Design a protein around this ligand. Structure first.
Ligand SMILES: OC[C@H]1O[C@H](O[C@H]2[C@H](O)[C@@H](O)[C@@H](O[C@H]3[C@H](O)[C@@H](O)[C@@H](O[C@H]4[C@H](O)[C@@H](O)[C@@H](O[C@H]5[C@H](O)[C@@H](O)[C@@H](O)O[C@@H]5CO)O[C@@H]4CO)O[C@@H]3CO)O[C@@H]2CO)[C@H](O)[C@@H](O)[C@@H]1O
Ligand SMILES: OC[C@H]1O[C@H](O[C@H]2[C@H](O)[C@@H](O)[C@@H](O[C@H]3[C@H](O)[C@@H](O)[C@@H](O)O[C@@H]3CO)O[C@@H]2CO)[C@H](O)[C@@H](O)[C@@H]1O
Ligand SMILES: OC[C@H]1O[C@H](O[C@H]2[C@H](O)[C@@H](O)[C@@H](O)O[C@@H]2CO)[C@H](O)[C@@H](O)[C@@H]1O
Ligand SMILES: [Ca+2]
Ligand SMILES: [Ca+2]
Length: 686
């Protein structure tokens, strides 16, 4: 199939995600609605179950609501079985209507449906070329109290009906008992409870194996993607090993939730997105968008900075999932605000780089503050709104104009309130003009683009006061007036002659695994794929077409490679980098070093004989290690994803800037488990 097919579980860049809060979407089967104090069919009590289910989704899929919008993928609430208890938080009743309070990852939430229902959902969806994404929260179970076992469900963890353990009297050590996080440090938010949620201990073999087994179940059920919840609260090392378990099995586009605040930029966040094996929800983008289009706390210059910065900070910017709001923040639209604001932010998002995600109800101008006010039942399924039409008109572009899905971003005109940017990919161009100023029009002159000479009509058809663009020689646009609150979309598509790689996924895996190379101009005849200098042709290339190539990762040494392709004619393509070839299946191992004294600003790192350990290159050392929660200075610890059943050589090092101090004596050794986890405790050697 082509890069745009619904069958492409490795690339969402051409899709549009519709984020759905199952319980608040549609109740297609009242028979499964919870009862008693846990229910509220009127949906007036936002903390109770309203009755939204999978059947409801199916109907909305079949009735044309989603399809008519141009939506090509859905992200639904965590499908697994949640606690049943009604939690009372200071007189206020609470339910697991959100599906984040897991009790059994191997079962479904009865309120949502049965495995059969789930299966129907996938079928219905696929039948309509819609990809299905599920939310997954392996960080914790549910709210608990070690002292009050009677509270809630004690965060009990069940394995397909079989009780694994609870928060109280946790002799097996399935959970963390270090209190709750204060969000002070990263380490802090990792080995501590998220609020009152029972924090799972991934260092525990039981938990580790269980979790990996569970995801496999869902994979087998045909999901197309995964939304990892609270990745900022789980050991990065473990997560990597989790991604491998996925990628080496049945790879699917995965992106985690690393919450970022206003004006907040995190290097850790960048590093994670670039080396975890999963991408992230583009909070930086979202926050900036709100500032500029919603709260007016920043201008176009800020927007531009964000675009260029992000394009440089993220190895795979096109994999980041963009948005303007979510179930965790105030709804974009304010009951009293000018709608055009929301429409504009929409257009911008839909035409920008990354994977666009729309929170259900947006197209309906839904307003609401923080949780749960931001999760009201969708008031209506009207296709008549302006927002609905914007999406309808812009969504499809991601599928027909590669510039939008894979193109680069370049500012072509800018001022306080105006922004004209260009997306480019091969022989395809897209130009977007935006005037956030709701009262003043702008005079645009000096606009230069990559568009060929000609006349371009606004893709929005004047829906947002857009206009026709006149391009002369040298891509120079004629002088024009950009209406107040104006938004226009112009584009040019054309056949691409030379092979151009637009996307790759998965980005991390072991040899043998088939990867998907998407782009244009690959030719119809099998060419050659390059993993560094290694050539791959023939059989190993399972499928080859103009827009897509499916190839098996050659058995090369574990490491980071650059991917390149050549058409049958010998023409080489651009280079896609940052490809990680694992040394094999992975396991999560905890490294502990004792008596590693250091000075302020000086941290400890880990290095060793495998690519997963940087191969002795201090510049690729693992760390800085931790020393607050689980273990305390001068003791250091860290969870690392290493090759299973491999005899590894390692040493620790002290780093201050780029200055490194090696551990003395001879290398340490150990053989990685074949499955599950392990803990390696050693003493720092002088
Ligand atoms: O977000 C987490 C945290 O991470 C990073 O901090 C880490 C440090 O980079 C790293 O050096 C390590 O810190 C150790 C330190 O190496 C060790 O020596 C010890 O530190 C002592 C000082 O030795 C001691 O003199 C005293 O410090 C004085 C300091 O002399 C004076 O100049 C002035 O700064 O006041 C200080 C008062 O504290 O106290 C400390 C504590 O005994 O212990 C440290 C660990 O406890 O590990 C850090 C992470 O744990 C970031 O750099 C940091 O901003 C982040 O908060
Ligand atoms: O590639 C050649 C070389 O690589 C490997 O050697 C590594 C060592 O095993 C490893 O300890 C580390 O060596 C550092 C010492 O531990 C430290 O005391 C100090 O001497 O710096 C050394 C690093 O420069 O790194 C090297 C690789 O750089 C392999 O084990 C060797 O057999 C092989 O000769
Ligand atoms: O003509 C090329 C020139 O166009 C853009 O500059 C705009 C500028 O952003 C506006 O604020 C205003 O000053 O008009 C200029 C064009 O005359 C690009 O921003 C700039 O890089 C480019 O050279
Ligand atoms: Ca129902
Ligand atoms: Ca945790």
């Amino acid at each position: 199939a082509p890069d745009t097919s619904v069958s492409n579980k490795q690339n969402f860049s051409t899709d549009v995600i519709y984020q759905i809060f199952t319980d608040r979407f549609s109740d297609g089967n009242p028979a499964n609605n919870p009862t008693g104090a846990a229910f509220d069919g009127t949906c007036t009590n936002l903390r109770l179950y309203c009755g939204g289910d999978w059947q409801g989704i199916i109907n909305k899929i079949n009735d044309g609501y989603l399809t008519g919008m141009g939506v090509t993928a859905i992200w639904i609430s965590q499908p697994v079985e949640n606690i049943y208890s009604i939690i009372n938080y200071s007189g206020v009743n609470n339910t697991a209507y959100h599906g984040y309070w897991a009790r059994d990852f191997k079962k479904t939430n009865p309120a949502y449906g049965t495995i059969a229902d789930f299966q129907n959902l996938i079928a219905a969806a696929h039948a309509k070329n819609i990809k299905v994404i599920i939310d997954f929260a392996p960080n914790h179970t549910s709210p608990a109290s070690s002292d009050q076992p009677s509270f809630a469900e004690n965060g009990r963890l069940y394995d397909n009906g079989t009780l694994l353990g609870g928060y109280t009297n946790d002799t097996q050590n399935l959970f963390h008992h270090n209190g709750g996080t204060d969000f002070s440090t990263t380490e802090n938010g990792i080995y501590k409870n998220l609020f009152d949620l029972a924090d799972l201990n991934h260092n525990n073999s039981t938990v580790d194996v269980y979790l990996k087994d569970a995801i496999k179940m869902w994979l087998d059920l045909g999901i197309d993607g995964i939304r990892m919840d609270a990745v900022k609260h789980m050991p990065f090392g473990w997560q990597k090993s989790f991604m491998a378990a996925v990628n080496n099995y049945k790879p699917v586009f995965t992106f985690g939730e690393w919450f970022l605040g206003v004006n907040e930029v995190s290097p850790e966040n960048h590093k994670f997105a670039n080396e975890s094996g999963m991408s992230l929800l583009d909070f930086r983008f979202a926050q900036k968008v709100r500032q500029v289009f919603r709260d007016n706390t920043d201008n176009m210059y800020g927007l531009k900075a964000m675009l260029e910065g992000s394009a440089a900070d993220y190895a795979q910017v096109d994999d980041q999932v963009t948005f303007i709001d979510n179930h965790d923040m105030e709804r974009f639209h304010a009951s009293n605000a000018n709608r055009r604001k929301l429409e504009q932010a929409l257009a911008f998002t839909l035409t920008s780089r990354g994977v666009p995600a729309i929170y259900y109800g947006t197209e309906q101008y839904m307003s609401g503050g923080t949780d749960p006010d931001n999760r009201a039942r969708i008031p209506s399924f009207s296709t008549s709104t302006t927002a609905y039409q914007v999406i309808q008109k812009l969504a499809p572009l991601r599928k027909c104009n590669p510039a939008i899905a894979y193109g680069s971003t370049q500012e072509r005109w800018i001022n306080n309130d105006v922004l004209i940017y260009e997306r480019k990919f091969g022989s395809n161009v897209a130009v977007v003009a935006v005037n956030r100023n709701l009262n003043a029009p702008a005079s645009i002159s000096g606009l230069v683009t990559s568009l060929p000479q000609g006349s371009y009509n606004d893709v929005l058809g004047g829906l947002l006061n857009g206009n026709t663009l006149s391009v002369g020689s040298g891509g120079a646009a004629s002088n024009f007036t950009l209406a107040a609150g104006g938004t226009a979309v112009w584009q040019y598509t054309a056949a691409t002659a030379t092979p151009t790689i637009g996307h790759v996924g998965p980005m991390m895996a072991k040899p043998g695994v088939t990867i998907t190379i998407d782009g244009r101009g690959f030719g119809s005849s099998k060419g050659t794929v390059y993993f560094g200098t290694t050539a791959v042709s023939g059989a190993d290339i399972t499928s080859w077409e103009d827009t897509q190539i499916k190839v098996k990762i050659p058995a090369v040494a574990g490491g980071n490679y650059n991917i390149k392709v050549a058409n049958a004619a010998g023409t080489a393509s651009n280079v896609y980098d940052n490809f990680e070839v694992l040394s094999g299946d992975q396991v999560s191992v905890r490294f502990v070093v004792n008596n590693a004294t250091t000075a302020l600003g000086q941290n400890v790192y880990l290095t060793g004989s495998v690519s997963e350990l940087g191969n002795w290159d201090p510049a690729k050392a693992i760390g800085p290690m931790y020393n607050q929660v689980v273990y305390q200075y001068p003791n250091w610890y860290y969870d690392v994803s290493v090759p299973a059943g491999k005899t590894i050589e390692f040493k620790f090092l002290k780093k201050q800037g780029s200055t490194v101090t090696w551990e003395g004596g001879s290398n340490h050794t150990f053989t990685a488990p074949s499955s599950g986890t392990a803990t390696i405790n050693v003493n720092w050697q002088p």
